[PDB]
Scaffold this active site. Sequence first.
Site, PDB file in Angstrom:
ATOM      1  CG  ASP A  92      -3.469 -15.660   8.378  1.00 49.68           C
ATOM      2  OD1 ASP A  92      -3.219 -15.693   9.495  1.00 49.68           O
ATOM      3  OD2 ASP A  92      -2.745 -15.303   7.318  1.00 49.68           O
ATOM      4  CD  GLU A 145     -11.121 -19.778  12.397  1.00 46.90           C
ATOM      5  OE1 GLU A 145     -12.079 -20.414  13.226  1.00 46.90           O
ATOM      6  OE2 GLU A 145     -10.146 -20.209  11.999  1.00 46.90           O
ATOM      7  CB  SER A 152      -1.351  -2.856   7.768  1.00 49.90           C
ATOM      8  OG  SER A 152      -1.770  -3.647   6.801  1.00 49.90           O
ATOM      9  CE  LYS A 157      -0.878  -8.638   2.033  1.00 50.03           C
ATOM     10  NZ  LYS A 157      -0.553  -9.694   2.441  1.00 50.03           N
ATOM     11  CE  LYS A 187       3.074  -2.622  -3.517  1.00 51.41           C
ATOM     12  NZ  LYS A 187       5.080  -2.946  -3.803  1.00 51.41           N
ATOM     13  CE  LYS A 199      -4.045  -9.746   2.617  1.00 51.89           C
ATOM     14  NZ  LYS A 199      -4.560  -9.804   3.886  1.00 51.89           N
TER      15      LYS A 199
HETATM   16  N1  LIG Z   1      -4.050 -16.242  12.555  1.00 53.04           N
HETATM   17  C1  LIG Z   1      -4.430 -14.836  13.827  1.00 53.04           C
HETATM   18  O1  LIG Z   1      -4.451 -14.766  14.603  1.00 53.04           O
HETATM   19  C2  LIG Z   1      -3.589 -13.523  13.262  1.00 53.04           C
HETATM   20  C3  LIG Z   1      -3.786 -12.708  13.680  1.00 53.04           C
HETATM   21  C4  LIG Z   1      -3.222 -10.947  12.842  1.00 53.04           C
HETATM   22  C5  LIG Z   1      -2.960 -10.605  12.221  1.00 53.04           C
HETATM   23  N2  LIG Z   1      -3.819 -12.020  10.980  1.00 53.04           N
HETATM   24  C6  LIG Z   1      -2.571 -12.197   9.312  1.00 53.04           C
HETATM   25  O2  LIG Z   1      -2.119 -11.044   9.421  1.00 53.04           O
HETATM   26  C7  LIG Z   1      -2.626 -10.326   7.874  1.00 53.04           C
HETATM   27  C8  LIG Z   1      -2.943  -8.612   8.152  1.00 53.04           C
HETATM   28  O3  LIG Z   1      -2.003  -7.848   9.349  1.00 53.04           O
HETATM   29  P1  LIG Z   1      -0.822  -7.774   8.212  1.00 53.04           P
HETATM   30  O4  LIG Z   1      -0.510  -5.487   8.452  1.00 53.04           O
HETATM   31  O5  LIG Z   1       0.599  -7.720   8.330  1.00 53.04           O
HETATM   32  O6  LIG Z   1      -1.753  -7.259   6.995  1.00 53.04           O
HETATM   33  P2  LIG Z   1      -1.321  -8.181   5.742  1.00 53.04           P
HETATM   34  O7  LIG Z   1      -0.078  -9.070   5.311  1.00 53.04           O
HETATM   35  O8  LIG Z   1      -3.152  -8.412   5.054  1.00 53.04           O
HETATM   36  O9  LIG Z   1      -0.705  -6.796   4.072  1.00 53.04           O
HETATM   37  C9  LIG Z   1       0.024  -5.729   4.378  1.00 53.04           C
HETATM   38  C10 LIG Z   1       1.441  -6.431   4.368  1.00 53.04           C
HETATM   39  O10 LIG Z   1       1.708  -6.915   2.672  1.00 53.04           O
HETATM   40  C11 LIG Z   1       3.232  -7.445   3.323  1.00 53.04           C
HETATM   41  N3  LIG Z   1       3.650  -7.996   1.702  1.00 53.04           N
HETATM   42  C12 LIG Z   1       3.704  -8.823   0.869  1.00 53.04           C
HETATM   43  N4  LIG Z   1       3.928  -8.380  -0.309  1.00 53.04           N
HETATM   44  C13 LIG Z   1       3.674  -7.236  -0.845  1.00 53.04           C
HETATM   45  C14 LIG Z   1       4.473  -6.320  -1.087  1.00 53.04           C
HETATM   46  N5  LIG Z   1       4.714  -7.098  -2.824  1.00 53.04           N
HETATM   47  N6  LIG Z   1       4.324  -5.396  -1.625  1.00 53.04           N
HETATM   48  C15 LIG Z   1       3.739  -4.802  -0.333  1.00 53.04           C
HETATM   49  N7  LIG Z   1       3.890  -5.733   0.892  1.00 53.04           N
HETATM   50  C16 LIG Z   1       3.280  -6.946   0.833  1.00 53.04           C
HETATM   51  C17 LIG Z   1       4.187  -6.703   3.988  1.00 53.04           C
HETATM   52  O11 LIG Z   1       4.871  -7.129   4.427  1.00 53.04           O
HETATM   53  C18 LIG Z   1       2.959  -6.082   4.779  1.00 53.04           C
HETATM   54  O12 LIG Z   1       3.786  -5.637   6.043  1.00 53.04           O
HETATM   55  C19 LIG Z   1      -3.694 -10.571   7.512  1.00 53.04           C
HETATM   56  O13 LIG Z   1      -3.518 -12.136   6.646  1.00 53.04           O
HETATM   57  C20 LIG Z   1      -4.532 -11.809   8.316  1.00 53.04           C
HETATM   58  O14 LIG Z   1      -5.592 -12.409   8.674  1.00 53.04           O
HETATM   59  C21 LIG Z   1      -3.730 -13.073  11.429  1.00 53.04           C
HETATM   60 MG   LIG Z   2       1.398 -10.953   5.372  1.00 57.89          MG
END
Ligand SMILES: NC(=O)c1ccc[n+]([C@@H]2O[C@H](COP(=O)([O-])OP(=O)(O)OC[C@H]3O[C@@H](n4cnc5c(N)ncnc54)[C@H](O)[C@@H]3O)[C@@H](O)[C@H]2O)c1
Ligand SMILES: [Mg+2]
Length: 318
Positions: free
Chosen positions: A33, A35, A83, A115, A292, A316
């Site tokens: 993540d 990277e 997101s 989170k 929030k 983060k």
């Molecule tokens: N490793 C990979 O190849 C790869 C590829 C794409 C994305 N990712 C990972 O996915 C994430 C970014 O994508 P995302 O849109 O899922 O973002 P995110 O997980 O960083 O933040 C948004 C998500 O947080 C979640 N969440 C968890 N606890 C919460 C809380 N208390 N309140 C509100 N929301 C909460 C919700 O499901 C929301 O969709 C990053 O961690 C990124 O590193 C990794």
């Molecule tokens: Mg997530």
Amino acid sequence: TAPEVLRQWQALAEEVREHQFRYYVRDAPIISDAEFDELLRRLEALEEQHPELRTPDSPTQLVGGAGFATDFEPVDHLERMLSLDNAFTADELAAWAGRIHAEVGDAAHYLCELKIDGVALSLVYREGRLTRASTRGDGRTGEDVTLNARTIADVPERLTPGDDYPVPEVLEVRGEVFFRLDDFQALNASLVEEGKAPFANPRNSAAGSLRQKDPAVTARRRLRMICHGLGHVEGFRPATLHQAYLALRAWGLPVSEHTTLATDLAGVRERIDYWGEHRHEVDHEIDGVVVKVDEVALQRRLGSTSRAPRWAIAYKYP
Ligand SMILES: NC(=O)c1ccc[n+]([C@@H]2O[C@H](COP(=O)([O-])OP(=O)(O)OC[C@H]3O[C@@H](n4cnc5c(N)ncnc54)[C@H](O)[C@@H]3O)[C@@H](O)[C@H]2O)c1
Ligand SMILES: [Mg+2]
Ligand SMILES: [Ca+2]
Ligand SMILES: [Mg+2]
């Protein structure tokens, strides 16, 4: 060189999209993540430096998962499912809080939540009965995993009416599906003993276990869920998120016991420092703290971008 910068953007955007596919569609990323986050930050910096590269369907503007097809039944959310933007430093956190303060003043209070590093899930209750459950998908349209969600013990089939909280005609509630860390390790060891590949990490284990064509596979696995947001609601008008959580609790929905309400940035920073030291004590994977704006009227005034609310930020940890 305008030619060279464009090819650079194209290679980086294609790479970002590849990893979004591997993560969101296959639950099988090939890089970490951290990277991935650096690649996405690189793309954004390239666009900030060269405005002609700003294009509406760049990964910098969309909900991760946009643009892919899957094997599940598509289903439209009742409200957009977004997101979160990120803060990786104290400066990025303070810049966000300043922007909140500049728009809505000292009246905002700040809900501080763990989170959860799980998979997003949206539930629809109609007159108190669970009628649908969907993944985030592209933020507008998700994947139908209703039968899978019904097997999660934390997810009730029916809301319990309260005298203070009548059951809404329509409740779309969002949350995180996840494994406790010991259950995550037990499933990986169980898979390895059967000769199958283990999941990369708790997030992909939870997402892959939820996104099963055969819901019986989901049923055998001790998935958990915590509600952390509202989509569309009819017959329920909470003035604040913390009052919404009181209703969700009354209705029998799972809410985190680790949330606190801060009055200002100083209070928020105290809670972020606290979880930096204590998150190893939480029995599930935590990748940060979500801050929030608590007042719903102020959330509506702050609004949201194409991909994230303007009234929340994910701090983060390293
Ligand atoms: N490793 C990979 O190849 C790869 C590829 C794409 C994305 N990712 C990972 O996915 C994430 C970014 O994508 P995302 O849109 O899922 O973002 P995110 O997980 O960083 O933040 C948004 C998500 O947080 C979640 N969440 C968890 N606890 C919460 C809380 N208390 N309140 C509100 N929301 C909460 C919700 O499901 C929301 O969709 C990053 O961690 C990124 O590193 C990794
Ligand atoms: Mg997530
Ligand atoms: Ca993403
Ligand atoms: Mg490749």
